[PDB]
Design a protein around this ligand. Sequence first.
Ligand SMILES: OC[C@H]1O[C@@H](O[C@H]2[C@H](O)[C@@H](O)[C@H](O)O[C@@H]2CO)[C@H](O)[C@@H](O)[C@H]1O
Ligand SMILES: OC[C@H]1O[C@@H](O[C@H]2[C@H](O)[C@@H](O)[C@H](O)O[C@@H]2CO)[C@H](O)[C@@H](O)[C@H]1O
Lengths: 141, 141
Amino acid sequence: SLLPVPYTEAASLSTGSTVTIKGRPLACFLNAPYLQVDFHTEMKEESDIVFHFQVCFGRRVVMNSREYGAWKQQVESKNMPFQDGQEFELSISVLPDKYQVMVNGQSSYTFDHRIKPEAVKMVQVWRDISLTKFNVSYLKR
Amino acid sequence: SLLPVPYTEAASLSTGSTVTIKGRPLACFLNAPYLQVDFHTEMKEESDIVFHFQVCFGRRVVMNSREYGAWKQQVESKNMPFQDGQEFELSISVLPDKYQVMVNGQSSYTFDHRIKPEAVKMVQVWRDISLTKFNVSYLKR
Ligand SMILES: OC[C@H]1O[C@@H](O[C@H]2[C@H](O)[C@@H](O)[C@H](O)O[C@@H]2CO)[C@H](O)[C@@H](O)[C@H]1O
Ligand SMILES: OC[C@H]1O[C@@H](O[C@H]2[C@H](O)[C@@H](O)[C@H](O)O[C@@H]2CO)[C@H](O)[C@@H](O)[C@H]1O
């Protein structure tokens, strides 16, 4: 739709930051579209990933980190609040101990910090979605 | 780039048809982009898939068919002629007994017919690529 995908925005994160994403899958769930949100340590796409969030719509969610080029311990979830054929609202909050992912207002995943959020310099949103809104909040000290 | 992705074209296939696709992955191989080519029995995306061709760039290729709504026997290949960061040329030939997939001029995969190619009514090309060329040939009787 309106925002380019893959979507890249230079970003900084700290405790209390919220990343808000509104979008829609590009295919019915039967065809297994993906969504991926990566919090990167540099603007280069090859850079480390502090928080990797990958939705296989209708099937599972995978979370991990890529640290000095290597993927670490995968977290796999079958929780699937996303609805077939529907627009979704995604909110990722930077809490002191973890990321908290809200989906359409509902707490849906959390992921403990493995690298401090201050290491983030870029956010990329990509795979089989269109996007109409992306925001990183910058209200807190 | 130039062609919309997901890309959909109404299509007919028979022995001797060639589907030609030129495109580029939207991410470096380290970030595991996908490419998917589906030969559908109807224009609806939910319709059966006579030939499903799914590249996880740098890792593997999966082929299958979706018949009366159900995925059948997966074929998994580690053959990976696609090159990191490069444009690719993909040619899918409809031979009497199988599809033959050429990648950059090189025979790279084949998949025996499970449903007659005459059942195809649509081709979709999607996931993490841009496309500059798509053609279905219509030269043969
Ligand atoms: O875990 C998320 C991450 O997986 C990558 O693949 C990892 C995989 O997680 C792990 O189980 C294996 O031992 O190593 C793989 C590669 O280092 C994928 O590249 C990726 O897209 C992510 O989803
Ligand atoms: O095989 C290609 C096809 O897999 C689908 O998932 C299948 C899977 O192949 C099979 O091993 C399992 O037993 O059933 C699954 C669902 O019916 C995926 O949906 C897909 O994207 C394809 O890659």
